[model samples]
Target: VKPNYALKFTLAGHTKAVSSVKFSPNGEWLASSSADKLIKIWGAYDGKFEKTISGHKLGISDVAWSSDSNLLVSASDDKTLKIWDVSSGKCLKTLKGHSNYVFCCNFNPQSNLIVSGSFDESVRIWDVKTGKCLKTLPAHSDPVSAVHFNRDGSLIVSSSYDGLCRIWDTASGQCLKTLIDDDNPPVSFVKFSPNGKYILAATLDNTLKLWDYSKGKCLKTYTGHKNEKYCIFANFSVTGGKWIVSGSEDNLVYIWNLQTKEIVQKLQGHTDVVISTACHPTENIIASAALENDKTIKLWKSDC
Candidate 1:
């Protein structure tokens, strides 16, 4: 039988399109950032609006939850990054230094240090408590679209419009390897496998390519949606990396088997483009953010 999945609920509040959606490490809160310049928090269990964070003068980019689930960090087009106290929606600290818009960011799993990528062609490491820039890796000739830490937090991965994903040693600031293929297509978004064995990159070419970053080789490529412009997101399912979840510019979501590299479900509901996607930290739920007219985040769970 053909596989199918269903929507659990649709979270609505943003006036503009959403940019990122993430669940807290403890799976209690859901945070979504939008081009509306607002970051809204919702109860992860019930989809109830919890808080709306505002302050950025421009569109909010990405949001990352702290490992302890006490703090959240966000980057924005205002050329700054801000850390928020989850309970109050108060900006605890504002990190400034990027000369251009800050687009991608996250906290290191072990510490409060933040690694952010920006349109300034750099990736900056920030000290969250000090509101200071710790280091700036002038990474790419083009704008850096994404930055993330490997599973153990020992290595960092950054993707760029130059069509490459570079792995760096977190402490030494040395690029250990560059992941590239015959057709890099400006590697827009990238994430490490749950077990840190591979890197899956969503490129501008409407294809998701998996890489063995350790070997600097492209292992396989996944195709199914349109992502012609901005960098989008993809994630691995909770149970030992059995599934790969992604959204498309085609108003649909794709969930595929990791080992088979074949789509098991194509979730369609939104009338507009779907770009941002996330799998729940604990449950078998998925959240996706759509563009323009859809301006909403949708959550889904399996019926089986």
Candidate 2:
């Protein structure tokens, strides 16, 4: 059986609501964005502030670090995404193309391509070096909430407020498949399994659906959340791909057994909505962010 325990670390600094938090590729740094219109980088080991970067005219929605660890990208309500130099904390490039809020952005693992999803209901692929939009995938009928590249960086998966999840060919911008929910409730987030054979989607209907990406069919549905959970992020455990971790607006973090389609553990500590979560690329460590009264970010461990 999986262990039942809870550990919490409060990352305090932002004066407004914390919107998102992500760990660097090497797991050495923790980056957080907030409605304070600031992005703060913290030491992953001790939870201490490294540097605070600012440029967004409105609340920051998302932040991503390049694989090399030298650059950071941030999306904001300002309707723009900015790439930054981590060392100097200077804005490297302000990518402006989305006509609405850029809700999410991610870097391709094998190329200089950056993908972003926006409230404009479209996804744009950019040439990171020249700041040029390489391709625009207008698949979602409503706001695109999240976008992520698969492990191999050959395919892109996106989830939208239209309650649909779609996959695209990275090189051709071709729509590969669409995981449609007949009820058509808003799909807040979607992510690929580490092996890239499966996709998990979280919805406003409080259900998590696992899809067979290869076949474009719903394979299983895991349900338990009490209310609308707006975000879902998943990664494999070091032991194996047996476990998947997720955070929700229901103020809980869950660890699921993929084979059984059952919740193995429910980790509760957040007093408010849990908006974002990340699993350590090489360890059992998991970090989560919440919009608490003081705009705090919480760190948790799987062993706890």
Candidate 3:
């Protein structure tokens, strides 16, 4: 959600395409985890390479940040989640409960809780302070591709390969809504609009769709990106999130005018599928990653 700034320097370590990059909320540090057993931290404004966290045994799928931005939680293919301290680059807690690859993890800064989804077709909730599995919801029939917490941490949204997107009440683990569409059921990720007015979904059918969960209304279907396997994500821009920034399997990144439902710009850089994207909460510092093994993470600055 945010990127950091620090001392100016450049250093390099990881050998593959970083799978996911998380910018700390305060813009102090950047965390990049990969398809390998590596998690590296970098400085935001200086491009300073700080440290490498070598804790996982397999590929990492997703990560979440703590409230103070000093800690991180990572979900991996090894069916575990770890609480990492950014300063010491040490694993503080190890959560082992999932039965399959954990593709998504949501950290709620409000109550110090974490939620994760996996190929095991379940959603598990964790108490970050205790590293305890508080609850488990058999939320999907297929792989749960993505999960996210609401702005106030009162709710959770989860997507799956079974063509379902379910909204859950975080406190009781009760499902509040089931949002589905004709063409976007097999969703890659489900995110809340900045205002929490709508649901944004990325599908395996190579499309993005906006929805009205309560009424089961498909507001708009966004086109121009191809996502076959990867969790190609999309987020809204500043100024009320009027613009949409998304990455593609076509090896392209796109900026779309949400009001008009049109592409604003098409970014081409990677040689293969663009798997993930992150936009700095307040700036134009957007980052994209490719699935290929070499020279993957790309950073860009957009003025508008």
Candidate 4:
């Protein structure tokens, strides 16, 4: 069977370039951040506007959802991360420690911890309950691009412009392994596989690789998308993990068959660089955001 997707909705609410988009783990809400320094929430299925959260002094780089979908976190170029209470749209706490732009942040599966990467060349773990900085690991030599926690919250994976992907032990904050490619291209995004045995890393060399982190070897490479300059992202489909989807600098969304690594579909509507992409947790839908030229979030639906 072939996968067919249709453009469902075009969400326009941001004033500047939309930086990131994510679906809540609970499958209730969709969140988006923009260089306009705001975070907006929408109804995941209906695509209706819900709320607009504003407090960051500068642009928001990324947004994440708590496991229970009750709380949300936003990383900003202002060097701080704000935890928001979703229902009331109130800022619960402001975590402040990073000396530079916080590029990426993720909530641990337990929802009690947060890990963030910054342009200061460091990764910081936060105590979510007390809003305290737990430990700061000098994780990368260059600007840290992305950071994510594994399924059980025991390990974290981080990538950087220095062209390295390193795994860390959450308890000891020790670097367990470094996965690097032969070309050493700057890495833009990385995430743990659903089963926790592999890693998906997207690099500026226009390739996304699946690596066996423990053995420190690349098992598969996914290509056919342009990603040479911006910090675009790619990830496995959240349902059965059958497909790998990514944003492209060439203004298209590319979906690849996980097993064969061939592009199964190309989504074309954006007029500028597609910077970020995310999928619904339990549905055949995808959300994507483009640069200033588009300034809108579009949703795609599929009947797989």
Compared with the true structure, all predictions reach lDDT values of 0.86, 0.80, 0.78, 0.93
Instruction: For candidate 2, write residues 1-304 as lDDT tens digits.
Output: 6745356577888888788888888889989998899999987756788999999999988898899888888888899999899989999889989999999989998649899999999999988888888898887989998898998899999999888889999999999888876788898888787778988888887777788977878877776654374555554555434676777767787777776778888877777777777766665666777775647776766552
Comparing candidate 3 with candidate 4, which one achieves the higher lDDT?
4
For model 1, the stretches where C-alpha displacement exceeds 4 angstroms are 1-4
- Could you give candidate 4's per-residue lDDT for residues 1-304 as a string of tens digits? 4468789999999999999999999898899999999999998987899999999999998999999999999999999999999899899999999999999999999999999999999999999999999999999999999999999999999999999999999999999999876789999999999899999999998999999999988888999899999888787885644899999999999999988888999999999999999989999999999999999999999987
Q: Residue by residue across 1-304, what tens digits does model 1's lDDT show? A: 3334688788998999899999998888889999999999988877899889988899988999999998889999999999999888899999999999998999988856899999999999888789898788978889898999987789899999998889988887888888766765888898888789898888898888788877777677788667888788988887334788888888888887777788888888887878788888777778889888899988887643
Enumerate residue pairs that collide in model 2. Answer: 5-304
Ranking 1 against 3 by TM-score, winner: 1
The parts of candidate 2 lying over 4 Å away from their true place are 227-229, 232-241, 292-294
Off by over 4 Å in 4: none
Q: In candidate 3, where is summed lDDT lowest over 10 consecutive residues?
A: 1-10
What would you estimate as the lDDT of candidate 1?
0.86
Superposed Cα RMSD, model 2: 1.9
Question: What's the candidate order when arranged by decreasing TM-score?
Answer: 4, 1, 2, 3
Error of 1 at 166 (Å): 0.3
TM per candidate comes to 0.96, 0.93, 0.92, 0.98
